[PDB]
Ligand binder design. Structure first.
Ligand SMILES: O=P(O)(O)OCCNS(=O)(=O)c1ccc(OC(F)(F)F)cc1
Ligand SMILES: O=P(O)(O)OCCNS(=O)(=O)c1ccc(OC(F)(F)F)cc1
Ligand SMILES: C=C(/N=C/c1c(COP(=O)(O)O)cnc(C)c1O)C(=O)O
Ligand SMILES: C=C(/N=C/c1c(COP(=O)(O)O)cnc(C)c1O)C(=O)O
Ligand SMILES: [Cs+]
Ligand SMILES: [Cs+]
Ligand SMILES: [Cs+]
Ligand SMILES: [Cs+]
Ligand SMILES: [Cs+]
Ligand SMILES: [Cs+]
Lengths: 395, 264, 395, 264
């Protein structure tokens, strides 16, 4: 029994060990209470404005659309405190944790941006934070490990499995199943068991709300499409949510194609996996013929995850949103292009969204289209990875 | 009716059950079959058997590593069902329960999974990441194929949950000792036991962190029908990988001692 | 002959080789023209808002003033695109460069934040950028070297002298003296020959303007004091300028004390040097008895400079602003304190300002005072330096 | 009146001046004095001498490194004035000009600096980072102590600058060959020369990038009173640090050839 619908069509649910159901119900009740609480909303708004720096800019590209009929705006979540959109909903969930009388935080992280967000919110709001991170990600996103630890968070490398995001997720959930009486599990994406896909959407939806207001101010109309990368789905559903009922606005989500879909080394379950049950949810996943969960791959740690949030699977199934993929090399080209022609260093995650927008433009350069890309994070965490690659390719 | 018959026999002898858990195919198919025959010969009243899964979220490192050993030996669910057929062919009355994760059951059809269980002679299935709230198609398929669906009673179960578990479950009720995941190193209630009896639930087996005879005796004295031990058993396997005969001897001593404690 | 006064009392002037005077006069005329040009001001404003992300937040500290009568706000220049205040005036000077028909940029950098700003503005506005950086700074501020190069700037290590900021300055000026026909020298601080101290102040003064509006909104009065670190002087004069005529508002500038003033290993010429002529200006400097320019030292590359902008020397001389120093160890403690108790990772430069504010509070904890610290940058560039230090100290 | 007398003598012989630059004390005090005596013996008409400064902003790497060598030998401005006294004691009529950076002049009093110049017998001072716009206290102090203040005429000098340089300067006018900093590797105007003469400026010496006899001849043929060469000279010092006698021989050959070219 729940207050809110745990499903998006066939997808979603609460597929966790029985021991954790009361924690999930408690979280749902606290969220529903907080959403109607003017004092909670005021506190959340104040943190977003005066601490995190909202609203974020909407930047018109000056150079990369030259010679085409594409107008491109970037929603600048890279300018948020912490360096990514992750900070929005962590501030909200941290307030929920306090509301429920919890003093400890468990989080998982891949790119380290949710880890950094969790750590900074815990420092601000007086919570004890421990963060699981795959050992491969500890290496390729090292600047964020340093940032988390400087802010007093405990960072726990995970060496099992692929030593990436799904493995950090597993450990976080295992931890929570024994520590939920005192710890809140601050899940970092729009996935997992109900109520997390709903809470994460509602605490990220200011991205699309602001975007709509900003594009109406600057262009006097809605975008032809909004484009976002999709790991678990939080920055994309955050951008999408306020446009879902604007039927003329395209919603485009970009999964990581890794080395190419044909190689099987990717993170694109929505279009190339099949429905399964894992990480507390019924959702598309990368799985073997027998139903073992497959390891994903992406150059970007934040997209390196073998499933996807259930609301995206639903929006796809009814045709309201379209999903595509972008390979490592396509993302790297977009990264370089934004650096050199707009002076913005994007996260490699965000570079997948930008790459698809550039493709929409280049493939049909006389097509009139007004596009917004969600620039979900800055690329400081990625600059050593990208440098090593370019060097090992001449450049 | 294998659980029903077992518990009736145990009750007439004023006895509790001892039920070991192992992972099917750990450390290899042949050695796993010998391990299981040793458990039974040493006095196991029933078995709980894991099918290796890539991401076992209710399990701690000991059983995580059991799954990995089985995968290193190339064990698949198909091979597990082959093993199950062989075990049942040898042992016609011992209740056999499977520990499953949802995706392995859901994968290519829930009904088809429970049908395969019935054909090889499995008696119960516990799906670890399906709570009662999500259980309808699983327990329906289970009952259609004469399989007992097993449900969990956690230490802080409210009355509604107690009533649901009593009504939906068959075979036995899993009485969780504590929160957390499986693990010997982490050791773990009369009110729950009495309430389950009041609601005519299947008999309760206590599990999680039971690694000593004293804990088994305490479970039965508190009114549980018996106890389950997994990690303690698996540790003996892990410790003796290079010494297969010493492995079986230590398994036999441990299981015999745990079973003796169930008579308290 | 100039349009504007090149001096602040005794300090300032245009002490450059004769060859460069026409370039300085041209720059002055272009600035004066641009300041009265509504189209220029609109373009500058648009970049500041929609590209750089102004206005920046004013954050009230929740935790670090507990148990005292100090109220502390941080002006969040760390949230500006690029990660520091440097971006403000680079956007303005880049527009001036274009206005003068220049297509090339020369810049110097120490912390690498002015370098990053110069590089990003050049990428955006279509200029060819070369950046001089001391070889010591290339090492201790390495993340910014990677960022500059990814954005297509040429980064030239300088090995002469102390291999820090003053040496990069020297090389930039030497370059300009031969390339001024096609290159604009984008000086990164409120120092050097007229008109740079004036231009840099006018293109940074939005910091104090915003601060004043924000503190009036939140507190209904002006601050008791505003506090900023001082390298060459740009973030401090940017914060100070709008308060100079508000006589009740204290202006406090914080020079680097390095290993301690008594060691001679510091960067605090305003209070511990003496007037000299160097880098195009008459200003306080660290110099030997004979008048050789001394090498400075600070743990923070952005403050590691043996002189100071002339307007700060003037404000000091008349008593309108007070200047103090903060040692390496004091700055490091402030860095750690902000990380752990407010969830903000500050630049080591900015940590000097914060350290002095914390001292004002701790020394007189029952003194009622409303303080603003200019948080001039984020500390991502510093996290590897700080980590190495803490490790080499237990921690 | 040493410049006035020099240029009158050169004019009566229909001759241009050749004026070498070196850094005082490079590579050491004693070798520097021998270098300077060799320059004079080889035909230098006047000298331009640098006082080592920590941050010489108008100088390229060759003369930067000359300053560093002098500092490695422990050379101070006090020691430079000792050297100057010795040079003047040997050579009573040759014009001696100093290349200074502003802080060394300003340091402990502008007036006191020019007073020290007068006492040792210096004839001119060129302060490289003081433009005419900032020059008042410098040129006033210079004239008070019978020192010629030297000013720069850059290639793109406007008429106002030409008039100012003509009026403020004494001794000679520095005609800059090109923009940039000092350097042999970077080679560098009749209108400026004619205008300076029209405004009765001190005679023009062309400097920056003059490293060949051909350039000296070209300077004088264009109407300049002579030419200055620094980096070319200093390179010969740098090249022969381990061979002091070969150094002086190569210095002598070069200076003699450059002086010969001034007769064109
Ligand atoms: O002795 P331990 O600590 O290893 O515990 C052994 C348990 N083995 S098992 O098959 O009964 C078992 C039962 C339930 C489980 O998860 C669930 F409770 F969420 F459903 C996991 C394993
Ligand atoms: O032959 P080069 O290229 O080494 O040039 C030699 C010049 N040596 S100097 O003393 O006359 C000399 C003259 C003027 C200088 O700077 C100023 F023009 F800004 F004033 C610097 C050096
Ligand atoms: C998984 C992580 N990051 C994901 C991420 C993503 C993808 O996650 P979502 O699909 O939940 O937005 C996109 N952009 C940035 C900057 C990100 O850091 C993490 O930081 O833990
Ligand atoms: C010198 C540099 N930085 C100086 C700096 C300073 C000191 O420079 P000003 O005194 O000009 O603000 C303060 N804060 C930050 C973040 C800085 O990066 C540079 O980035 O080139
Ligand atoms: Cs366009
Ligand atoms: Cs994914
Ligand atoms: Cs995905
Ligand atoms: Cs306070
Ligand atoms: Cs300084
Ligand atoms: Cs200073």
């Amino acid at each position: 029994t729940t207050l809110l619908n745990p499903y998006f069509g066939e997808f979603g649910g609460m597929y966790v060990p029985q021991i954790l159901m009361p924690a999930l119900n408690q979280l749902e009740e606290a969220f529903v209470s907080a959403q109607k609480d003017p004092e909670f909303q005021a506190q959340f708004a104040d943190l977003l404005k005066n601490y995190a720096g909202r609203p974020t800019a909407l930047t018109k590209c000056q150079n990369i659309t030259a010679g085409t009929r594409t107008t491109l705006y970037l929603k600048r979540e890279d300018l948020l405190h912490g360096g990514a959109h992750k900070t929005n909903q962590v501030l909200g969930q941290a307030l929920l944790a306090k509301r429920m009388g919890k003093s400890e935080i468990i989080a998982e992280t891949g790119a380290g941006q949710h880890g950094v967000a969790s750590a900074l919110a815990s420092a601000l709001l007086g919570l004890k934070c421990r963060i699981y991170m795959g050992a491969k990600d500890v290496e390729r996103q090292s600047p964020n490990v340093f940032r988390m630890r400087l802010m007093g968070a405990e960072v726990i490398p995970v060496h099992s499995g692929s030593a990436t995001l799904k493995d950090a997720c597993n450990e976080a959930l295992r931890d929570w199943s024994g520590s939920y009486e005192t710890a809140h599990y601050m899940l970092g994406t729009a996935a997992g068991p109900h109520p997390y896909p709903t809470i994460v959407r509602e605490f990220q939806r200011m991205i699309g709300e602001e975007t709509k207001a900003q594009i109406l101010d600057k262009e006097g109309r809605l975008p032809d499409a909004v484009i976002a990368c999709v790991g678990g789905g939080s920055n994309a559903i955050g951008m999408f949510a306020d446009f879902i009922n604007d039927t003329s606005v395209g919603l485009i989500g970009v999964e990581p194609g890794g080395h190419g879909i044909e190689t099987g080394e990717h993170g694109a379950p929505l279009k190339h996996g099949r429905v399964g049950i894992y990480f507390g949810m019924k959702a598309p996943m990368m799985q073997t013929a027998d139903g073992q969960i497959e390891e994903s791959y992406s150059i970007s740690a934040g997209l390196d995850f073998p499933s996807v949030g259930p609301q995206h699977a639903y929006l796809n199934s009814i045709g309201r949103a379209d999903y595509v993929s972008i390979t490592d090399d396509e993302a790297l080209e977009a990264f370089k292009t934004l650096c050199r022609h707009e002076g913005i260093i994007p996260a490699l995650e965000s570079s997948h969204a930008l790459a698809h927008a550039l493709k929409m433009m280049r493939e049909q350069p006389e097509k009139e289209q007004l596009l917004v890309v969600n620039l979900s994070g800055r690329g400081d965490k990625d600059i050593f990875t990208v440098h090593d690659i370019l060097k090992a390719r001449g450049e | 009716e294998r659980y029903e018959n077992l518990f009736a026999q145990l009750n007439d002898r004023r006895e509790g059950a001892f039920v070991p858990f192992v992972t099917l195919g750990d450390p290899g198919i042949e050695q796993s079959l010998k391990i299981i025959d040793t458990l039974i010969d040493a006095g196991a009243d029933a078995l709980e058997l894991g099918v290796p899964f890539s991401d076992p979220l209710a399990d701690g490192p000991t059983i995580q590593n059991a799954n990995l050993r089985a995968f290193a030996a190339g064990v698949t669910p198909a091979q597990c069902f082959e093993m199950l057929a062989l075990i049942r062919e040898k042992h016609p009355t011992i209740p056999i329960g499977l520990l499953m994760y949802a995706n392995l059951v859901f994968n290519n059809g829930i009904d088809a999974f429970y049908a395969r269980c019935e054909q090889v002679g499995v008696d119960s299935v516990l799906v670890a990441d399906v709570p009662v709230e999500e259980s309808a198609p699983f327990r329906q398929a289970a009952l259609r194929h004469n399989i007992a669906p097993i449900f969990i009673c956690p230490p802080n179960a409210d009355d509604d949950l107690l009533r649901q578990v009593a009504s939906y479950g068959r075979g036995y009720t899993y009485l969780l000792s504590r929160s957390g995941v499986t693990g010997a190193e982490n050791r773990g209630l009369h009110h729950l036991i009495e309430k389950l009896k009041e609601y005519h639930a299947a008999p309760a087996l206590q599990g999680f962190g039971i690694s000593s005879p004293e804990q088994v005796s305490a479970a039965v004295r508190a009114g549980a029908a018996g106890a389950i031990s997994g990690s303690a058993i698996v540790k003996i396997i892990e410790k003796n990988l290079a010494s297969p005969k010493q492995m079986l001897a230590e398994l036999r001593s441990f299981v015999s001692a745990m079973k003796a404690a169930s008579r308290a």
